Amino acid sequence: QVQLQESGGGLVRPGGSLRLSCAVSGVSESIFANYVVGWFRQQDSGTGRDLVAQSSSDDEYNHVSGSVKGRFTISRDNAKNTVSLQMDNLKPEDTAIYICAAAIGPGDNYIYWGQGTQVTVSSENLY
Amino acid sequence: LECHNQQSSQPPTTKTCPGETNCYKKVWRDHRGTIIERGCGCPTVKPGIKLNCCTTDKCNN
Ligand code: NI
Ligand code: NI
Ligand code: NI
Ligand code: NI
Ligand code: NI
Ligand code: NI
Ligand code: NI
Ligand code: NI
Ligand code: NI
């Protein structure tokens, strides 16, 4: 069965960078090439799950949201079955839970969903 | 599950989709002002569309 594992969360100081990654377990044949793998940001009470990036072989279904354009970048190792989201110049406003999702194909619905990983940008003391 | 489906700022309407645990609110600007399309499920999306997927009933407002 397909199951999505995320990795890379934590606390980043303002202006730093950090790379999340989402590995699609299942499809262990490694023929998931065209899973439209999405990265969503959930800022708790504010807003539900906001699509921040979408990764597909199909150009029209491979893009980044304009809000983070220029700061975030997606990468793919289809062979190793990973979809990474590198986040540079991280601002406090980017503090949120980032979740991975996978659709079986371009235009189909995100039916697979990830665990979630917290990203915190603040510069404040962690106790 | 239950989710809205009205377009942009028409009066709130509902659509019941049994089993669908996620919902969506898509926004694109277009020539004719901010257009909004709400519905069931969490769909993959073409370029330049503000997608927001959601998890509770009638939460894609
Ligand atoms: Ni939002
Ligand atoms: Ni192309
Ligand atoms: Ni292109
Ligand atoms: Ni692009
Ligand atoms: Ni700020
Ligand atoms: Ni198409
Ligand atoms: Ni219900
Ligand atoms: Ni029902
Ligand atoms: Ni409502």
Author numbering:
A (entry chain A): 1 to 127
B (entry chain B): 1 to 61
Quote the study that presented this structure, word for word.
Here we addressed this challenge by immunizing an alpaca and a llama with the venoms of 18 different snakes, including mambas, cobras and a rinkhals, constructing phage display libraries, and identifying high-affinity broadly neutralizing nanobodies. We combined eight of these nanobodies into a defined oligoclonal mixture, resulting in an experimental polyvalent recombinant antivenom that was capable of neutralizing seven toxin families or subfamilies. This antivenom effectively prevented venom-induced lethality in vivo across 17 African elapid snake species and markedly reduced venom-induced dermonecrosis for all tested cytotoxic venoms. To gain insights into the molecular basis of the broad neutralization of the eight lead VHHs, co-crystallization, cryo-EM and in silico structural modelling predictions of the VHHs in complex with one of their target toxins were used to determine their binding interactions.
Throughout the phage display campaigns, we utilized cross-panning strategies, including for example, exposure to sNTx fractions from different snake species and/or decreasing antigen concentrations in consecutive rounds to enrich for VHHs with broad cross-reactivity and/or high affinity. First, we evaluated the neutralization of sNTx-3 and lNTx-7 using VHH5 a-sNTx and VHH9 a-lNTx, respectively; this resulted in the survival of all mice. Thereafter, we combined these two VHHs and tested them on the venoms from Naja haje and Naja melanoleuca, species that are known to produce venoms rich in sNTx and lNTx. Pre-incubation of the venoms with these two VHHs prevented lethality in all mice. Pre-incubation of venom with a mixture of VHH5 a-sNTx, VHH9 a-lNTx, VHH15 a-Og XI and VHH13 a-AgTx protected all mice, qualifying these four VHHs for inclusion in the recombinant antivenom.
